[PDB]
């Protein structure tokens, strides 16, 4: 009558390494350039 300790069929065997982990995000942006500036509403020559 000894069955020889029969094993299960068929399980979550494909999940045994699984968690799963998460990816990443980082946003974060670049500064625009506003260095092209000069005023016009005054005098630079006729002041002299």
């Amino acid at each position: 009558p000894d069955l020889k300790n029969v094993k299960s069929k068929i399980g979550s065997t494909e999940n045994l390494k699984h968690q799963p982990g998460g990816g990443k995000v980082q946003i974060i942006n670049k500064k625009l350039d506003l260095s092209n500036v000069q005023s016009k509403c005054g005098s630079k020559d006729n002041i002299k």
Binding site: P1, L3, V6, K7, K9, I10, G11, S12
Partner: protein, 150 residues
Amino acid sequence: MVKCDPRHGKYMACCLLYRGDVVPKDVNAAIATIKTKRSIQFVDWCPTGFKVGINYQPPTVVPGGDLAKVQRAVCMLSNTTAIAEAWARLDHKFDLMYAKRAFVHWYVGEGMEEGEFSEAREDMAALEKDYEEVGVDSVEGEGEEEGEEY
């Protein structure tokens, strides 16, 4: 309506069907009450463990019956390790008849193999261990019974 103790098994899935004068909020509250009474342990690998259905027609009892009449009623189908533990009994009564090869000539006599019984036993023993793997739900614990020193 099966001779197995659910408190000894572990709940796995439920479908609840509602009939008659029924309110969806009260069905929601009833099921929420079961989920907060977590002594009715469901598997931790399936928290969303309920399906629901609701129908407007109340049950009719066939005349000459014994069932009381009601404005509303509930039917359930439940999957739980307890009923596989009832199968594990029915397999160990097969095993006892087959351990003395009792009756097998009424079936070999039809042109079966005795090999079929041995195949069937082993298939069933594989099923009981399939259910053992999902009874093992790797649920987390709660506390220890004792405290500590320092």
